[PDB]
Design a protein around this ligand. Structure first.
Ligand SMILES: Cc1cccc(NC(=O)CN2CCOCC2)c1C
Ligand SMILES: Cc1cccc(NC(=O)CN2CCOCC2)c1C
Ligand SMILES: [Cl-]
Ligand SMILES: [Cl-]
Ligand SMILES: [Cl-]
Lengths: 695, 697
């Protein structure tokens, strides 16, 4: 049920031991020594990774290393489709803009931060959550020139439990992290977007990197003279596999949770955030799908845009299913009622006052928040010509020196990025007509972006005519129309351009709504500091975990399937047989790598198959994970690596608000399948030889 | 493999059934010289099974089996299809026109008699051995002079089994006064609607209730207000003990057809011609229909039923092709025939190998013709609505060529035009479907094999299918109402003889009939060779573990209540519950609406004695019994012969079971009798039906 601070390991250790944990507490996390925690990294700012050899080899997901695999891919060597296996360390590919962060030390600095905060004065100050203010406190504690005296190291203070606990992290960052290995995309992304959030899952979602450093193992940017890092700790790889009910644990960097939402915040999340995103994306996706099915060229141009829209659409459907069926609102209501009754017993009304301030703020911002989600989902992300070019102040104060041609070259560049090889004005007009029809039905005239008032005023309510007119008369409506403008440019033409006026008007409204909504966050934040303080004082910092905030956490559970619906059971483990059942050669998402298909046919599973001769692929566990946990090491009762977390089932996406023991599962790629792919598909024996594989 | 056994085979199967859990005595289930549970089974309305559940002739069958009768009694004022129907007294039960229930009074092996009669052979290639007319002449000869008039209600029929190696005579008692007694609302009776057709898990309360009426002596009689409920020889006791995983279960019913003795070449043909063409052509037709239904709410109303009717056999063909690809159906038929050929070689009898060779040669010779037949049937006859547009008869063309018979011919043609261009017909949707179907058809069928009018696509329209279709509607008398009316005002045979739609429809029906007539002769050598093939199989491995193909006759099947794994890491259990109905509820989707009275029963847990030991309300279960079309409504029995459910469907994974039973995938989908009684009780409030049934603890 939780994403626990490393400091809470002492308090959780006895429960973990009763659940099957065999390793000593300080071998997992030691606050003043080397522990397994030292083999976990924050990979490229938003993923987790793990060190698996004494030469700095790192495992993470294929979707985590995707950008690096794509940046090194060419027509001649397409690593994204074919995979990549550096047969020697010198062949591993450097990556620009990459980092791996180690959590060297963690300290509780609550008393220090709370004493510093006493000098504020303004009771409503938000400095207690300000990265800038907390960095000034972190620098003060670390020392004037800490990073110079301890190179590669940096300090950071973060707030936890709504500002009731503060931790200082000493981080070691390495920026020379080289691509070592990756399976083909047919393995790394087998389900592709069709199996996203799905269990059972058959995806070999892994990629391999290596941390390089200077001669002393100290962080250093890319240099041909850099040498592989010899880390203080790395994971041993287990080949013992998993069985149903086995203890499993994860360490990683979960990004965000909303475990302390009031019942009113759950209602708002459902009725505004989720329902608007669901309704608007269903409209957008429906038009896009119609057009992609009718024209093979439209399918090529819009596949990625369609897939990008579907991901959070599916998340919102899953979250709304939890709200409707798992009593999330009711359980938050019971949590707050229990605190209110306990506060009334103690004579302290501040907790009830805090819940009331949150409810009142949620109620006051409802119409504004509805207008914001409506324009964001409906227009900002719904309509491509909303992101068409808007002449900057430097460009208009140049068209009316003769750098008129410089302004036109900059506007032309932006027009070519908007109307690129994947942009269809006809598809965009159809999407806009459906999205604007919905938007105009929901937003009244007095709340419309100024240009949209022309639908009623000038076009007699004809949305199609309004959209047709935008493209017919706009300098960005076609290449010929842009070129005619670029030959005789005038600021007058840009000032009256229907597409420019539309884009400007919708961005003006979007920014105005954002600016008006931003002040409502602060009273909720301040009231949450009092709310969570009461919850902790009443029930303890035992079963109530601090919200995720991109910091190192541990979670434990068991390898266990679940029943998704009446009379259906999904087991704890998928096999290579399941990959073969899903094979569809004329569907790019479900193509099977020929070398992998041959391994399955010959049963060339070596030491990686289970006791029954079946080749495992993935497993699921009752660990509590969220976005940020992609690539996290999954450990045995002995702390040996048994898999990598890569996804979570849609049924458990409501778990960011309320953990769902009977539905929520972490989706993990079995380490035996990772090794089978490195070995039989990649043929990269040197990677197997450098790992410490335990029988 | 698992079997749809003859009642005669119960004796030789009894010990295996007893070892599998059967507790009842053999003759209580079936006795040829007395009353048995077989006497409570009926063929309901010619194509379903039913069962007698009371000493007052009450009958249970599926809701989809009684659907037409529920619909015929439904009006705007009393919509029984939507709300259900529960006659609160026998006098309120609704009669039905054109209904029947058939009892199998006696079954007799007449093999020696038929085989002796057949020896009077004039032609060794004669098909009389399978002719309903010839076998009826033999049945009448054996039964006696004017049997029907001397035994009112009774009739005799002889059927061939095992490809003509076994013959049975059935003495049938038919009742035609069968009244509607009760039905749940369609939201329960067809809960899954077409979305859940062929699907397990299943949450459908697929049942309806009738009552057999007869004269004062319990003898068959057509509808009369003086008819009285039938007191039957036998009826089923209802069990409330329920089912558990691995429980013995058995069914009796009337499975229609199987192809258990197909050669490997017939499996290849079924896959590569029949199924692949139906799949490809229906995917094209359905795709266009769906795009049009999604774009226009009025097109969705007009085409929903046509779309659903196309999807049913499309899904069946996908499921059958999945079995051929993954369950080794071709290989197992090949092994069956190779084993017989090897045994025939040892016996010194080459006739079995010669018979399999004749079947392979006939299959190979008819391939191109059969491909052309399925291509035109799926692609045009079923695929394009204007293929079934009006064609003026020889008498209609004669009437139009000096009498008032002209206005009579035009009224007849108009009537047919109004049936073609009805409230559900869209010429625009039809032109779009035809353009896609004809494009595929023209790609597969060469010019010399085309229906004569389709040659105009290349010859007159320069390969433009859209222009050819546009021209058919632009110039045809049946292209629009105004075009028909202009023809009807000044009709001439000349105009009909040159009509592009008439010429298209005539041409495609001419080709369809020519292909059918040329293919029909190939059936006979296969049939004659199958008589020798199945005779060899029976002589070699015995009529013990090789069942006779289904032929709409009474059969029994046994197995266990058991789920299965459909794919890697997924298990479907043996039983669904009321909880599963509630998970599927979607008020804005007509297929998944939940009856308010039923939803309240679930909320209050008002399950009474119908819930399982854990307090869960069961809905449906699945079993390893071997069923097919014709088994809808069949009684499902306990080890004691008590009614535990009604069969209503089978999962798509087991549709290949008509050729080869699939022990790890094939399941009969059954509505739990506890759920039937829960609905009669808590939804219908029809206590008198519960009171007349013999319910055992
Ligand atoms: C939460 C959510 C919302 C909407 C759609 C999806 N995905 C699917 O339904 C598709 N997969 C693959 C093929 O169809 C069966 C399931 C999900 C996961
Ligand atoms: C063999 C075959 C072929 C094609 C489709 C189907 N059925 C479905 O997929 C329909 N529904 C969709 C969502 O609800 C569950 C099933 C089958 C059974
Ligand atoms: Cl290190
Ligand atoms: Cl012979
Ligand atoms: Cl099987």
């Amino acid at each position: 049920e939780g994403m626990w601070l490393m400091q809470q390991l002492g308090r959780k250790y006895a429960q973990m031991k009763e659940r099957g944990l065999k390793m000593k507490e300080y071998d997992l996390y030691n606050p003043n020594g080397t522990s397994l925690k030292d083999a976990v990294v924050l990979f490229d700012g938003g993923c987790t990774g793990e060190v698996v050899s004494d030469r700095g080899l790192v495992l993470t997901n294929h979707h985590c290393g995707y950008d690096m695999i794509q940046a090194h891919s060419t027509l001649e060597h397409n690593y994204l489709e074919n995979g990549f296996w550096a047969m020697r360390e010198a062949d591993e590919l450097p990556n620009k803009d990459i980092s791996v962060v180690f959590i060297d030390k963690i300290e509780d600095v609550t008393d220090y931060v709370k004493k510093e905060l006493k000098a504020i004065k303004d009771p409503n100050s938000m400095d207690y959550l300000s990265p800038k203010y907390l960095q000034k406190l972190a620098d003060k504690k670390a020392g004037k020139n800490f990073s110079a005296k301890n190179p590669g190291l940096s300090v950071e203070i973060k707030a936890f439990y709504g500002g009731n606990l503060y931790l200082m992290f000493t981080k070691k960052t390495y920026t020379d992290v080289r691509l070592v290995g990756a399976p083909p995309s047919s393995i790394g992304k087998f389900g592709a977007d069709t199996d996203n959030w799905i269990w059972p899952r058959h995806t070999g979602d892994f990629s391999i990197f290596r941390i390089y450093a200077d001669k002393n193992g100290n962080p250093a940017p890319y240099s041909e003279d850099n040498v592989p890092l010899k880390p203080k700790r790395f994971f041993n790889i287990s080949l013992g596999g998993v069985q149903e009910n086995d203890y499993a644990m994860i360490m990683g960097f979960p990004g965000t949770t909303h475990r302390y939402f009031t019942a009113s915040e759950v209602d708002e999340w459902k009725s505004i955030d989720n329902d608007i995103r669901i309704r608007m994306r269903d409209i957008r996706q429906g038009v896009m799908l119609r057009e992609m099915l009718a024209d093979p060229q439209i399918k090529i141009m819009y596949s990625a845009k369609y897939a990008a829209s579907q991901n959070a659409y599916k998340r919102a459907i899953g979250a709304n299913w939890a709200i409707k069926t798992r009593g999330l609102r009711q359980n938050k209501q019971a949590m707050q009622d229990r605190l209110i009754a306990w506060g009334a017993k103690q004579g302290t009304p501040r907790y009830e006052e805090a819940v009331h301030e949150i409810d009142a703020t949620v109620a006051k911002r409802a119409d504004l928040r509805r207008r914001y989600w409506m324009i964001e989902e409906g227009i900002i992300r719904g309509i491509e010509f909303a992101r068409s070019p808007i002449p900057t102040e430097d460009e208009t104060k140049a068209l009316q020196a003769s750098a008129r041609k410089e302004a036109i070259d900059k506007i032309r560049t932006r027009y070519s990025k908007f109307a690129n090889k994947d942009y269809s004005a006809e598809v965009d007009k159809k999407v806009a007509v459906a999205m604007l029809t919905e938007y105009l039905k929901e937003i009244p005239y007095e709340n419309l972006p100024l240009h949209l008032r022309l639908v009623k005023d000038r076009f007699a309510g004809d949305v199609q005519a309004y959209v047709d007119d935008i493209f017919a008369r706009s300098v960005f409506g076609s290449e010929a129309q842009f070129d005619a403008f670029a030959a005789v440019p005038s600021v007058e033409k840009l000032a009256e351009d229907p597409m420019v006026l539309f884009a400007s008007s919708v961005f003006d409204e979007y920014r105005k709504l954002y600016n008006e909504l931003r002040p409502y966050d602060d009273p909720i934040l301040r009231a949450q500091r009092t709310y969570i303080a009461g919850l902790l004082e009443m029930d303890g910092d035992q079963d109530q975990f601090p919200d995720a905030n991109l910091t190192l956490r541990f979670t434990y559970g068991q390898v266990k399937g679940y029943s998704p619906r009446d009379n259906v059971y999904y087991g704890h483990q998928t096999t290579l047989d399941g990959v073969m059942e899903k094979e569809d050669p004329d569907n790019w998402e479900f193509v099977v790598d020929p070398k992998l298909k041959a391994v399955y046919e010959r049963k060339d599973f070596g030491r990686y198959a289970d006791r029954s001769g079946r080749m495992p692929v993935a497993f699921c566990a009752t660990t509590h994970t969220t976005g940020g946990n992609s690539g996290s090491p999954v450990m045995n009762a002995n702390g040996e690596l048994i898999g990598l977390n890569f996804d979570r089932n849609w049924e458990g996406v409501g778990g960011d608000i309320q953990y769902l023991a009977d539905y929520q599962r972490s989706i993990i790629v079995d380490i035996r399948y990772v090794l089978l792919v490195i070995d039989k598909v990649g043929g990269c024996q040197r990677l197997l030889d450098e790992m410490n594989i335990v029988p």
